[PDB]
């Protein structure tokens, strides 16, 4: 496979301000009506965040802009998206983005989510292709439009889908979805959340606490990555891809001391750097 579409432009990355955001739970010990302060990797408040354009329409007619770059992992990574239609599935996290290192491959054609830590060959323009199988008459997902080779694989796992819809809401939710990715001490851990947002794009003032999903015995350093996509095929109208619009939020983590104020219930609310 490795069918590639680059196009051209970057544009100045449209930035934003995470007000109170990215506050994951530091320990696995439940704390109610008590204050605990740790110094750990976080996304510091009111920091410089980068909101991205994935496949993007700036209207004249059409003009879908596929910009999503390979991005360094740096210290740690934060992620946020709305995507009432789901074009986003997983991320390519790795180092060489090639063989010679392992590869963290997450995808989501989801009765369920599925996770892969393997050695792949990722193409120049990787993303998950989706087509129509005409037998069972369903929509399959061609997964090798992302990567050519799958071999040597070190680890595999399956779980209930992290990405989840609700919809029926004609908006007013947008189903804002956040995922934090922190790679330490042999455990690369994933944190998820789902939140309604009525604002047009950017983030509210509310606090979002993400419980750890799975603590994975990984063992690789990931210095760079890119997201994944779900596109499809169309037929004769005046290759074919780019369902809907796609945009998301990315920011890098950083060690900071954040006092965590638990509620009577024990759910963290106020976090101060």
């Amino acid at each position: 496979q490795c069918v590639n579409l680059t196009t051209r432009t970057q544009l100045p990355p449209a930035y934003t301000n995470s007000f109170t955001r990215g506050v994951y739970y530091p320990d696995k010990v439940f704390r109610s009506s008590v204050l605990h302060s740790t110094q750990d990797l976080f996304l510091p408040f009111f920091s410089n965040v980068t909101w991205f354009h994935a496949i993007h329409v700036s209207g004249t007619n059409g003009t879908k802009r596929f910009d999503n770059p390979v991005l360094p992992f740096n210290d740690g990574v934060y992620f946020a998206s709305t995507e009432k239609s789901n074009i986003i599935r997983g991320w390519i996290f790795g180092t060489t983005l090639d063989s010679k290192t392992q590869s963290l491959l997450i995808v989501n054609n989801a009765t369920n989510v599925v996770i892969k830590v393997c050695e792949f060959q990722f193409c120049n323009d990787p993303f998950l292709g989706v087509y129509y199988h005409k037998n069972n008459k369903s929509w399959m997902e061609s997964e090798f439009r992302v990567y050519s080779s799958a071999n040597n694989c070190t680890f595999e796992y399956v779980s209930q889908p992290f990405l989840m819809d609700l919809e029926g809401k004609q908006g007013n939710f947008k189903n804002l979805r956040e995922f934090v990715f922190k790679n330490i001490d042999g455990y690369f851990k994933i944190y998820s959340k789902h939140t309604p947002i009525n604002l047009v794009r950017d983030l509210p003032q509310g606090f979002s606490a993400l419980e750890p999903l799975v603590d994975l015995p990984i063992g690789i350093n990931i210095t760079r990555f890119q997201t994944l996509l779900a596109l499809h095929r169309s037929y004769l109208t005046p290759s074919g891809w780019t369902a809907g619009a796609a945009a998301y939020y990315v920011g890098y983590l950083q060690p900071r001391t954040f006092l965590l104020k638990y509620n009577e219930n024990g759910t963290i609310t106020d976090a101060v750097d």
Partner: antibody
Framework: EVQLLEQSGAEVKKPGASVRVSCKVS????????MHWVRQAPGKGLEWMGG????????MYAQKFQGRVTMTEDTSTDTAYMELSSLRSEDTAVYYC??????????????WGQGTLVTV | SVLTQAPSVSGAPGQKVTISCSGS????????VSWYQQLPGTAPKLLIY???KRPSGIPDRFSGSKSGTSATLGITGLQTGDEADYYC???????????FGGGTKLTVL
């Protein structure tokens, strides 16, 4: 968008034979889109043949020619074999590989296969 | 085959004249119509689909209409390279299949 592979090649089979027709594609995958077939006799018109049905999900067979010609599909190698049997007088002709949308409800045969004559 | 159109038609270059195909309610009545072009010993090319829609690469000078069981293929701005046969087709539920007419070979005079 898409260019296709040829329908057959040059297949010349003397009377007392039968011939498969393997039409491959490029730029798509085989079972995202439905194939079709049309008899075209030189100096003559179109006679539709084979074909897939968007409704009911079956692969159609032209009633007039039904049972004489069959079709199979290999999804990964994109090979769709059209086997016509029991050669007769007027049945040597160009038989076009054609396609309609997998989404269905489309009658138009779309980019097609350049044509291949057969032999009786 | 089961449809109605003439073997050939002729007209002077650069003029405006169309070609029609007469079906029935069992074929054209409830179904969408297509039109095709082939040069001698060549690949028959889709002309217009649903009679109102142009495939990619078709001159806008072509139009179409469906009046009852009658479907006309709009042909305008005749060219020296426009001489070829045009074929009408529409879905058939009678034999539950695809049908065509005998074809009409245009001639640009």
């Amino acid at each position: 968008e898409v260019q296709l592979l040829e329908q057959s090649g040059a297949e010349v089979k003397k009377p007392g034979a039968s011939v498969r027709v393997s039409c491959k594609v490029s730029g798509y995958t085989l079972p995202e889109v439905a194939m079709h077939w049309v008899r075209q006799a030189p100096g003559k018109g179109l006679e539709w043949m084979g074909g897939f049905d968007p409704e009911d999900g079956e692969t159609m067979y032209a009633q007039k020619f039904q049972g004489r010609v069959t079709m199979t599909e290999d999804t990964s190698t994109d090979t769709a074999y059209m086997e016509l049997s029991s050669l007769r007088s007027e049945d040597t002709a160009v038989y076009y590989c054609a396609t309609t949308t997998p989404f269905s409800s489309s009658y138009w045969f779309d980019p097609w296969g350049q044509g291949t004559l057969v032999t009786v | 085959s089961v449809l109605t159109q003439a073997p050939s038609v002729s007209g002077a270059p650069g003029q405006k004249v169309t070609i029609s195909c007469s079906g029935s309610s069992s074929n054209i009545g409830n179904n969408y119509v297509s039109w095709y072009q082939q040069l001698p010993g060549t690949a028959p090319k889709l002309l217009i689909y649903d009679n109102n829609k142009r495939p990619s690469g078709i001159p806008d000078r072509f139009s179409g209409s469906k009046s009852g069981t009658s479907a006309t293929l709009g042909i305008t701005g005749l060219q020296t390279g426009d001489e070829a046969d045009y074929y009408c087709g529409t879905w058939d539920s009678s034999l539950s299949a695809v049908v065509f007419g005998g074809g009409t070979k245009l001639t640009v005079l």
